[PDB]
Swiss-Prot record:
This is Polyketide synthase PksJ. It comes from the Bacteria. The gene is pksJ. The lineage of its organism: Bacteria, Bacillati, Bacillota, Bacilli, Bacillales. Belongs to the ATP-dependent AMP-binding enzyme family. Involved in some intermediate steps for the synthesis of the antibiotic polyketide bacillaene which is involved in secondary metabolism. The acyl carrier 2 domain binds glycine.
Length: 452
């Protein structure tokens, strides 16, 4: 594994060359809040369908030029997934010779924006990547400025929609169009002591990378109190002796608790529904009462859906299960730990949040991890919160089974030791709120083309 780098999302001018209108129907996805905007957008499309999701599909989808989604310009309820089936149906049933999907947000990107407006985060991640999963699509996320008037915004939208671009992600700042790309962090491509009476909280800490982090913090940062959370409820401690010769995942967890406790660490392995406000409150009160204040959080709770790959074959329910730990779960956890004396709050995101080619066949996972990226950017002022867009870990967790796009990306799969060193640097330094640490074979690596 050759060369370490740290990539962050940067922006450069990408002017539109021509904007030729069509006459096929354009769908306009909105909600009650964004309906006035949607009406203004609609005046640029003589042929349109306004789909207000807060008001089923008997549509001749093959007659459409595409869809403009402006729900991300309002509140954009992360828990309401009804909008998804409109996108799926258009993607599946639409013309195979080109159709356009355009997602518009307002002030979601931190570029030339001192105040991230946390709306549209999961949806941006979907639209960024759909053209890599479906070769016939042109799909784009566009971020406008929060100040932009509806009339001006509608004009920008219409030109963008019918543009000659295949850029995955763009923003407009002071009337100028910019495209997103990845680049080695600007200058940095020490550490304080973790207090012995504070607790390190690790969600998804019971196996995989999170457990590896647990061992690492106990060994190298002198952590004395660990709370490791997952979904499984371990049996009472009195039962544990019956699992000595078991080869089960539960046996391994029990053994891991014992090995940590041998290092002189107090360890609790808990079941916690992270999106359940009442349970998270109660559990956090228990920790604070009986162990001590929270000195750090590592958010590893996460699932990939390995059964249903195609976006158009996923149900709302499937998608919700993948989002839950990273979206609702993260938000709920944050509300109950943001006033603790945190040294760090590290989110385990993925290269699939941001590299469209790797998102393919796992669109819901890209949505989930994308939300965490923006969440860190939006809350960096209030908490030492960092989203890490991890590459594949070769030796622990979900494992590798890496595909051609991953190999073709020039990303390498990383060792545990590589990953932990990456983590230590990310905590010790200011790479900013979102960073993609990669091991790359330097000869054959063009980070600046990763998002194209
Ligand atoms: N492995 C890799 O290469 C990469 C991993 N990541 C991310 O790193 C994190 C850990 O990855 P990995 O170690 O492979 O994962 P594993 O599947 O090995 O471990 C998942 C852990 O999270 C817990 N968990 C899963 N779903 C939930 C949920 N809904 N609520 C609470 N806890 C949950 C599991 O608990 P239980 O055992 O009780 O189910 C388990 O402790 C994930 O968030 C993943 O997206 C990112 C990039 C690459």
């Amino acid at each position: 594994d050759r060369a370490a780098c740290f990539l962050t999302k940067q922006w450069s001018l990408s002017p539109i060359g021509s904007a030729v209108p069509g006459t096929r129907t354009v769908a306009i996805l909105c909600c009650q809040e964004t309906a006035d905007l949607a009406a203004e957008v609609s005046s640029y499309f003589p042929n349109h369908l306004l789909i207000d999701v807060s008001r089923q599909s008997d549509i001749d989808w093959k007659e459409f030029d595409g869809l403009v989604d402006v729900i991300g310009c309002g509140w954009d309820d992360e828990g309401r997934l009804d909008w998804i089936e409109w996108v799926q149906r258009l993607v599946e049933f639409g013309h195979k010779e080109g159709l356009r999907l355009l997602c518009v947000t307002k002030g979601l990107e931190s570029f030339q924006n001192t105040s991230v407006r946390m709306a549209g985060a999961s949806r941006a991640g979907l639209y960024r990547m759909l053209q890599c999963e479906y070769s016939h699509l042109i799909s784009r996320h566009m971020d406008a400025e929060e100040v932009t008037d509806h009339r001006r915004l509608a004009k920008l939208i219409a030109d963008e929609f019918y543009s000659d671009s295949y850029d995955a992600e763009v923003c407009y700042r002071d009337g100028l169009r910019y495209q997103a790309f990845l680049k080695a962090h600007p200058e940095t491509g020490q550490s304080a002591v973790f207090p012995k009476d504070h607790v390190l909280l690790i969600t998804g800490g019971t196996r995989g990378i999170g457990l590896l982090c647990a061992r690492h913090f106990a060994e190298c940062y002198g952590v004395k109190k660990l709370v490791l959370t997952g979904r499984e409820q371990l049996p009472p401690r009195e039962e544990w002796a019956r699992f000595k010769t078991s080869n089960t995942s539960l046996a391994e967890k029990i053994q891991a608790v014992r090995e940590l406790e041998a290092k002189g660490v107090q360890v609790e392995m808990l079941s916690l529904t992270l999106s359940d406000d009442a349970q998270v409150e109660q559990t956090l009160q228990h920790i604070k009462r009986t162990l001590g204040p929270i000195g750090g959080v590592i958010h590893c709770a996460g699932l990939t859906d390995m059964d249903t790959l195609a976006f158009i074959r996923k149900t709302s329910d499937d998608i919700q299960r993948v989002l839950e730990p990273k979206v609702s779960g993260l938000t709920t956890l944050y509300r109950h730990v943001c006033n603790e004396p945190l040294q760090f709050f590290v989110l385990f995101s993925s290269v699939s949040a941001i590299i469209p080619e790797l998102s393919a066949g796992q669109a819901d996972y890209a949505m989930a991890n994308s939300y965490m990226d923006y969440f860190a950017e939006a809350h960096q002022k209030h908490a030492p919160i960092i989203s890490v867009q991890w590459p594949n870990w070769k030796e622990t967790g979900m494992g590798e089974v890496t595909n051609q796009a991953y190999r073709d990306s020039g990303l390498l799969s990383i060792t545990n030791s590589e990953g932990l060193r990456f983590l230590d640097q990310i905590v010790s330094k200011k790479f900013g709120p979102v960073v993609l640490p990669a091991m790359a074979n330097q000869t054959n690596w063009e980070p600046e083309l990763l998002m194209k």
